[PDB]
Amino acid sequence: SMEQVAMELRLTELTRLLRSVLDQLQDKDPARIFAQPVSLKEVPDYLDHIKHPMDFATMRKRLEAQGYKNLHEFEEDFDLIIDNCMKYNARDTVFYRAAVRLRDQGGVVLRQARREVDSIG
DSSP states (O other), X not given: OHHHHHHHHHHHHHHHHHHHHHHHHHHTOTTOTTSSOOOTTTSTTHHHHXXXXXXXXXXXXXXXXXXXXXXXXXXXXXXXXXXXXXXHSOTTSHHHHHHHHHHHHHHHHHHHHHHHHHHHO
16 A cells, blocks of 8 residues: 555654664764673573673664664663663673763763654654
8 A cells, every 4th residue: 555655664764763873872882892692602691690682783683674663662672782781790890881881872862863753753
């Protein structure tokens, strides 16, 4: 139908906007601490601690399959990256501190993204 196409064009444009959001959040991680999945070869007990692992490469795969229906779903995944790290790693670690800085800096990007998503519809 024409409606399914219109719906598909909206999803494509959301994907375009979320790709730009993702790039901007990932620049706030210059150490690439959150770029890839935590390695289960190197951290073999990880899944005993963290039930829903997440990372930027995994988000990008979902994004490029148009797997985020709305900004809320995308934010859920970003928040998993931060929150998983802050549980697994102690406060005095470069990993925890990296997550705090990513959360704080990402807040600004996500604030305007929400306005843009509502505004453009």
